[PDB]
Design a protein around this ligand. Structure first.
Ligand SMILES: [Ca+2]
Ligand SMILES: [Ca+2]
Ligand SMILES: [Ca+2]
Length: 724
């Protein structure tokens, strides 16, 4: 789309004579009182661009100090209000107004026609605003003399809201909401915000299904709030893209907040017994973005009739908190294992894992090991403040991180660890990095349309949190956090549009998430509910169970986690699978009498895939005696599993008798007794990959003959590094 200035006025073009049925609104194009026809003609057939009333609204400044009267080119049907005063009324009652050069004052111009006029009529193209000086010398008011309303100012919202409820001709306040009313003064009529609108090159129209095929986005927003998600930008500034285009493109939707999230990660982590770092041990270190949300979580299962499950953290934290895990040593640890102190060095990297651009920030970071602070980065290490775009890092990806020993807080020294602490790091107790971003700023537009600093992110963080739910997606390589519009269903005057968790994933990940055959994929990997492991806080767990358990009211059709209607301060962490097996991509071995099934992870011995009218699942083979289905992992199928890591192996299962689910990894094997179910239910079993003890098989060991076992949607998701 065009990057447009805030010059000219904002034009409202109505079908009816009484400013009640708005057809389109747009800023006015250079030295005219009309709009861009190339864009308008794509949004609305030329034949429907015929209007019986027009309002132009915004600000005027004179290019010279003086005493002026005003007129429209067709003056007998125009009324002009300036600074709340009627200064011309159908060509009569002209007031002389003193205007100081460069001083913007509110202006509202209204025009009524006795029959509809097409925008392409001579008269429409001819409309101008004229300024008459003390000599009765006539001047067209120039584009640089005009500005749009200052959308983010309360006084401008009051001016727009008032203009939507009355007009200068009849002077009778509207008794009820119509298709012109703009209660919150964000420029977009209440009924458009509820029922749908689109904007292209700052031309806004009501939604029509003919706009879907042309690829336009249907926006909805809260008609009672100029900032539906509480971020620095109005609903209109977001939908119109009239904001810092460094913000992520998902934020050009009123229902997705612009919100930075700055964290710090560590790379090239070493330990030495020597202060000078000679004879350092290197590491297979890992960053665990969502550690506190997963490690030690409790699993709640058997949720609703579809029997889904989720994890619950007692220590839920957002994406500014990161865990650093040593992973494993590289090199001779003989010396380090006898030492009374160790010395840690690393490179650090700042990551903006949110959707909002942040400028001039000097983040503070604590480094905490088993509740003890071992280091702090203060403003002192970033005398040159940072500016980081969403999804980017400083230093940028492909550049080395910053050595801790080079940063001013560290005085050219590594991090000292006492003997106990050195053992804690080597045994995969995490170093927690918690980062704060309280001086970082965002950019806005001032009354003349200039880019200025708008304020600190700290100043908008409360309102964003109060109006949104948080979604964190962690694929074990990077993390991303989104804040999306949420609704309090207990408060009917909260007119925020309803959004599900699935709808929110689609809106907030426009590049990474696609929907294929009704299921979401994240960078071509599964992110559908049966494939992922989702972690909640206690509040969110209670809210989800309430919606599932409601069979009759607002939530009667909520039966799955991804169908949950978002409520304020809900928190979700989604772990994307590192391996998965779907019966939809499996083939039977043995032709007419199958004995096994080959899928994405390997061969299920003593299983076959069954198609029931398009619905595929695995079933245990039934030759007349008990067998145990056994997944023989193929060479390479578990190459994505981190060493010295814990996981969940999850699947949906149904059996008429109990069975034992076994993960064989030698001395690190796990097992669970699974109760009989009438319906598929999700089961989640912990699994361990300890270096030297690969995961060899999954086995479903039955109890009882005769019986049946069916399963589908096997997934493996990361938890965290295994403590030694
Ligand atoms: Ca509005
Ligand atoms: Ca609004
Ligand atoms: Ca329900």
């Amino acid at each position: 789309q065009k990057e447009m200035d805030r010059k000219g006025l904002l034009g409202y073009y109505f079908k009816d004579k009484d400013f009640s049925n708005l057809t389109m609104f747009s800023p006015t194009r250079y030295n005219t009182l009309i709009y861009d026809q190339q864009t308008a003609n794509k949004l609305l057939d030329k034949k429907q661009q015929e209007y019986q009333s027009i309002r132009w609204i915004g600000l005027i400044q004179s290019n010279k100090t003086g005493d002026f009267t005003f007129e429209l080119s067709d003056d007998e049907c125009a009324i002009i209000e300036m600074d709340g005063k009627v200064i011309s009324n159908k060509g009569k009652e002209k007031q002389v107004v003193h205007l100081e050069k460069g001083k913007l004052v509110p202006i509202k111009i209204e025009y009524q026609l006795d029959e509809p006029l097409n925008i392409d009529d001579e008269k429409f193209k001819g409309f101008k605003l004229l300024k008459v000086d003390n000599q009765k010398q006539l001047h067209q008011v120039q584009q640089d003399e005009l500005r749009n309303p200052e959308f983010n100012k309360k006084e401008s919202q009051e001016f727009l809201a008032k203009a939507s409820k009355i007009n200068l001709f009849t002077k009778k306040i509207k008794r009820d909401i119509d298709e012109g009313t703009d209660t919150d003064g964000d420029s977009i009529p209440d009924m458009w915000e509820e029922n749908g609108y689109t904007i292209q090159n700052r031309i806004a129209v009501k939604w029509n299904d003919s706009l879907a095929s042309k690829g336009y986005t249907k926006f909805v927003s809260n008609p009672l709030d100029s900032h539906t998600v509480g971020d620095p930008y109005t609903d209109y500034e977001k939908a119109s893209r009239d904001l810092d285009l460094s913000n992520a493109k998902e934020t050009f939707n009123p229902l997705v907040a612009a919100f930075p999230s700055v964290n710090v990660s560590m790379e090239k982590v070493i330990l030495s017994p020597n202060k000078n770092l000679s004879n350092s041990v290197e590491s297979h270190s890992s960053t665990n973005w969502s550690y506190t949300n997963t490690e030690g979580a409790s699993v709640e299962a058997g949720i609703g009739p579809k029997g889904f499950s989720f994890g619950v953290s007692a220590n839920y934290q957002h994406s500014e908190t990161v865990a650093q895990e040593w992973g494993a040593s590289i090199g001779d640890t003989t010396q380090l294992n006898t030492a009374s102190a160790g010395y840690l060095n690393a490179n650090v990297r700042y990551n903006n894992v949110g959707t909002g651009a942040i400028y001039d920030v000097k983040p503070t970071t604590s480094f905490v090991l088993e509740k003890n602070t071992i280091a702090t980065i203060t403003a002192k290490s970033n005398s040159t403040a940072l500016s980081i775009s969403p999804g980017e890092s400083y230093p940028k990806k492909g550049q080395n991180g910053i050595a801790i020993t080079s940063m001013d807080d560290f005085n050219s020294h590594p991090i000292t660890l006492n003997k106990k602490q050195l053992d804690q790091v080597l045994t995969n107790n995490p170093i927690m990095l918690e980062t704060d971003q309280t001086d970082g700023i965002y950019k806005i537009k001032d009354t003349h349309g200039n880019i200025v600093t708008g304020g600190t992110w700290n100043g908008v963080t409360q309102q964003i949190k109060a109006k949104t739910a948080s979604i964190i997606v962690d694929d074990g390589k990077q993390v991303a956090e989104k804040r999306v519009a949420a609704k309090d269903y207990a408060y009917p005057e909260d007119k925020t549009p309803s959004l599900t968790l699935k709808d929110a994933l689609k809106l907030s990940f426009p590049e990474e998430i696609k929907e294929t055959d009704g299921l979401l994929y994240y960078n071509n990997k599964p992110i559908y509910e049966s494939s992922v492991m989702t972690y909640l806080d206690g509040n969110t767990a209670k809210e989800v169970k309430k919606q599932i358990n409601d069979k009759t009211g607002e939530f009667k059709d909520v039966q799955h986690l991804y169908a949950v209607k978002l409520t304020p301060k809900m928190n979700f962490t989604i772990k994307v699978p590192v391996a998965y097996d779907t019966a939809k991509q499996a083939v039977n071995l043995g032709g007419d009498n199958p004995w096994g099934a080959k899928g994405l992870l390997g061969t299920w011995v003593n299983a076959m895939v069954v198609d029931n009218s398009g619905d595929k699942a695995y079933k245990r083979v039934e030759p007349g005696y008990l067998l145990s289905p056994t997944l023989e992992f193929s060479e390479g199928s578990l190459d994505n599993l981190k060493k010295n890591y814990s996981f969940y192996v999850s699947m949906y299962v149904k059996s008429d008798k109990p069975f034992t689910l076994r993960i064989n990894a030698g001395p690190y094997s796990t097992k669970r007794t699974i109760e009989a179910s009438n319906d598929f239910k999700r089961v989640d079993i912990p699994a361990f990959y300890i270096e030297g003890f690969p995961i060899d098989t999954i086995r479903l060991e039955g109890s009882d003959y005769p019986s049946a076992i069916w399963w589908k949607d096997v997934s493996i998701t990361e938890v965290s590094a295994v403590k030694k």
